[PDB]
Design a protein around this nucleic acid. Structure first.
Ligand SMILES: [Ca+2]
Ligand SMILES: [Zn+2]
Ligand SMILES: [Zn+2]
Length: 60
DNA sequence: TATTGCCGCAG
DNA sequence: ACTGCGGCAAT
C-alpha cells in the first residue's frame, strides 16, 4: 500500500522519503556542520544545536 | 532530485 | 538528562 523506496548504498537501510536518507548518509560521513557556540559540539543542523543548548542552563 | 524546521520516539 | 534517529511539510 508504507513504501520505503529510498535506501543507503553502503548498508541498505531504507527510508520513506529522501530526508531520512540524506540524514543517514551524512551520519555515515560524520558531516555535522553546525556547532554549539558555547561548547563547540557539532550537530547535523541548527535545529539539533538548538535542542542541545539547554545543557548549558543551570539545573534546578 | 536536494536540504532543514519541527518535533515525537526511544534508549 | 541528552541525543541519535526519521517522518512530514515546506522550500
Ligand atoms: Ca518517528
Ligand atoms: Zn547506511
Ligand atoms: Zn554546547
Amino acid at each position: 500500500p508504507s513504501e520505503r523506496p529510498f535506501f543507503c548504498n553502503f548498508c541498505g537501510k531504507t527510508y520513506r522519503d529522501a530526508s531520512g536518507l540524506s540524514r543517514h548518509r551524512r551520519a555515515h560521513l560524520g558531516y555535522r556542520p553546525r556547532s554549539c557556540p558555547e561548547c563547540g559540539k557539532c550537530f547535523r543542523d541548527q535545529s539539533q544545536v538548538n535542542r542541545h543548548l539547554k545543557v548549558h542552563q543551570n539545573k534546578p
